Structures are given as C-alpha cells and as structure tokens.
C-alpha cells in the first residue's frame, strides 16, 4: 500500500508537522567514534546530546538513519541469508526527545502515526512494557485506549534499555502488529517500533538514579514496516528490495523461492549489494583490517554465495548501479559516488575472483577427505592455509564447512598464528593468545 520511498518521507514529515528539526543520515562511519566501526541506530550520531556534551538549536529530532549491524554486540552478518528478517545495511526511522517531551507523547505521537498515517487497524495492534513500568501501562490502557488484553508487562530482557553498562537507560515499549493466524510467534506478532523512555542513570555500581531530563528514542526498521504494508512475508520481498533479488536471477539463471539454499545466496547477495554500495559511497575503502575488512568480508562472501549459483564472473559491481538508481531519490549522493563504487567493487571482484575459486576447490577437497577418513572438524593447518594461502575470512571457512557439518579447530587455527606470527619473530596489533580471536576481523596480511 506504501513505498518504501512513501513510508520515509511520511514518517519524518509527520514528526517534522510537531517541533521535529529533520535530522539527515549521519555517514556509516563515525567521525569521531574510533571503537564503533558502524553507525548502528538512530541516537548514536546523538549520543552525547542525550549525556549533555552536545548542545543543539534543537530539542526535538526526526530522522532516517542508515545504519549498519556487522560489528560487536550488534552484528547479524552471521545470520544474513538464511531468514527473512536480517540485514547488514538497513535504515531506521526514529523520533527524538532532548528530554523535552517524554512517555505520553511519544506513545501519543507513535499511535497516531500507525493508526492514522499508516492506516493500520487498532485492534491488531498489541503493545509490550517493563512490568515494573506502571507509567507507560497506564498511558496505553486508560489514555490511549488499548485493551488490557493486548498489553504484554515484560521482564528487563524484553522491556529495559541501556546505552551501555553504565550511563543513560530505561524501559521500553513495542509496537507489534498481529500479522493473522496463519503464522506463529514473533512472525506473527512481528515487532515494528521500540520506544525508548531514557528515564535513568546507571552508575559504576549498578545503581539506578532518575535523570534530570528524562530523554526519549526510539526506532522503527523501514525494511520490516514496509514489507506489513506492502503485505510481504519477507523484508527482501518489498519494493526497494526485492529487485535486487531479481538481480540475482538474472545472473545466474536460478528462481528466487524454489530451493532454499539458492534463496539463501540470493538474499545475500542482495542486501550485500546495499551494505558495500553505501558504505564504500561513505568512504570506506576494502582493506585488511577494520571497517575495510569488514566490507572486503562481506563482498567476499556475496562473491562466494554467487559462485556458489554458478557465476563464474564477476558481477557485483553490475548491481550497485541498480541500488543507486533505487536509492537515488532519498540518497542523491549516492549518484555523485556511483562509478566510484562500482569501480571499487569491480576492482575487488577482479582482485579475489580467482583465488576465490582455487580456494573453494581447496576447502571442498579437504572437506571431502575429512569426511572420508571420519573427521568432525577442519584442523588448524587446514584453515591457516586457506586464510593465509588463499585469503579466506575465517567465518567465511568455518561457515562452508558448516555446509556439510564440519567444524573448525580453534586451539589448533590459534597454535598455527603463534607459529606464523613466530617467523617474523623467530598496521594491527595483537596480544598473544589473542591472535586467533583477532583474526575473525582482520586479514592473514594484517597480522
């Protein structure tokens, strides 16, 4: 019923139509943040207005927020491909309070919108707050109206927010949409929106104290809300998507929806497409350490993904014109940055393409003999040499060895890297021991 292009626009006029200043997309990349690799929601470009170390004109906000979840205690990049839910590049819309405004409107503002500018029905909508929060319960049930039987009081894993260990936190409420009978779970009451009431300090000791000016964030993923309207069972299903997948089908001659493992390299490739696209447009360049490395995994897992359909060529830097051309209205940049990117990507697939392919032959093969002579698990010689021979990620290794239920000798990956880092003894750095928890995120060059 609505494009997702529509679903933004709206959202942000509609919060820009009460106090809202338009906030646009801070870059992927944070300026001034060297431990986050990735912007990876809404308040983190304003993080420090809601600790008060940045001042702004502003006291109400409104954005959509291109974000990215592939590093840390926020990373779905292992998930990506095999459901229907996950991404690595996706954008979050989200409404702000510097703590002007705090629970009642924010619910009040976040109903209307979803009943009235979203048109969704009221009674299939169900709510969810911390059981401890009589506050925000009361605020649903007696204002805004909503039976006692489609509230849900949760415990703090569900229903409580923290900005870190220490610092800003407090409950939360969902928005859930009941999707019909015909599903189970949170599929079926599939979360749309998370308000966040930063109503509380938590200090060193795990105590909680109230905040001067209680703050309000909040986060609704564009991907998921899209595919409810546009009555999508799948986020990679909707408009902006989904011709990505269709991408997919072109190259390489296989249907979306017909094996899922073809499904799986398809999604991949598709929302990969998205993540490189606008993060080499932001200015990241594919290296060995780092967000570069980061992005030279993910576009050599879609690589991988797209061989795996038969793609003997290389044919990613085809489909960044195809994102660029879809994100061009609410991302303008992205065509002053188009042939850029393509030529990166082009430059990259060039560069592996090859060695991809001698290494999948060699991963197969001791795959193959592994299972042959009744081993469980690739040893550590097996999984240095295709890392450091062939240039394979070590998730990229351990997740084609899960294909066949294979997998890989950490102790013995760890002995081989002190033996390795030792003929240089006898840039990145690494603690000793740590080394093969390090080289999950960098490449064999870097160490």
Request: hydrophobic residues 35%; aromatic residues 12%; contains cysteine.
């Amino acid at each position: 019923s609505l494009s997702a292009h529509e679903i933004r626009e709206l959202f942000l006029s509609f919060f820009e139509k009460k106090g809202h200043t338009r906030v646009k997309s801070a870059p992927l990349v944070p300026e001034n943040d060297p431990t986050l690799l990735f912007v990876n929601a809404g308040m983190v470009p304003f993080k420090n207005v809601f600790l008060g170390l940045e001042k702004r004109p502003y006291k109400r906000a409104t954005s959509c927020q291109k974000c990215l979840r592939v590093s840390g205690k926020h990373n779905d990049l292992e998930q990506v491909g095999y459901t229907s839910r996950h991404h690595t590049f996706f954008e979050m819309l989200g409404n702000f309070s510097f703590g002007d405004y705090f629970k009642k409107e924010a619910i009040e503002y976040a109903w209307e919108f979803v009943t009235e500018v979203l048109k969704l029905p009221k009674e299939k909508l169900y709510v969810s707050v911390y059981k401890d929060d009589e506050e925000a319960y009361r605020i649903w049930n007696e204002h805004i109206g909503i039976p006692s039987e489609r509230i849900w009081r949760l415990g703090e894993e569900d229903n409580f927010w923290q900005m870190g260990d220490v610092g800003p936190c407090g409950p939360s409420s969902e928005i859930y949409v009941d999707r019909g009978e015909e599903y189970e779970g949170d599929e079926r009451y599939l979360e749309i929106w998370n308000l966040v009431f930063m109503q509380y300090n938590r200090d060193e000791n795990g105590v909680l104290t109230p905040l001067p000016h209680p703050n309000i964030d909040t986060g609704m993923g564009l991907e998921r809300i899209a595919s409810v309207l546009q009555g999508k069972n799948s986020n990679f299903e909707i408009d902006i998507i989904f011709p990505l997948i269709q991408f997919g089908e072109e190259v390489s001659g296989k249907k979306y929806g017909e094996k899922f493992e073809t499904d799986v390299a398809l999604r991949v490739i598709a929302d990969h497409l998205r993540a490189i696209t606008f993060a080499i447009s932001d200015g990241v360049i594919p290296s060995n350490e780092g967000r570069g490395y980061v992005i030279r995994r993910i576009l050599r897992r879609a690589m991988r993904f797209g061989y795996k359909l038969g793609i003997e060529n290389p044919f990613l830097y085809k489909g960044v014109d195809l994102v660029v051309d879809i994100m061009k209205e609410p991302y303008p940049e992205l065509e002053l940055s188009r042939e850029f990117v393509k030529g990166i990507v082009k430059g990259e697939e060039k560069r592996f393409i090859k060695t991809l392919k001698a290494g999948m032959e060699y991963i197969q093969e001791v795959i193959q003999k592994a299972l042959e002579e009744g081993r469980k698990t690739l040893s550590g010689k097996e999984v240095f040499t295709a890392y450091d021979t062939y240039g394979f990620p070590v998730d990229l290794i351990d997740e084609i060895a899960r294909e066949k239920g294979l997998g890989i000798d950490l102790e013995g990956f760890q002995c081989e890297l002190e033996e390795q880092r030792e003929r240089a003894r006898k840039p990145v750095y690494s603690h000793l021991k740590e080394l093969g928890k390090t080289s999950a995120f960098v490449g064999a060059a870097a160490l």
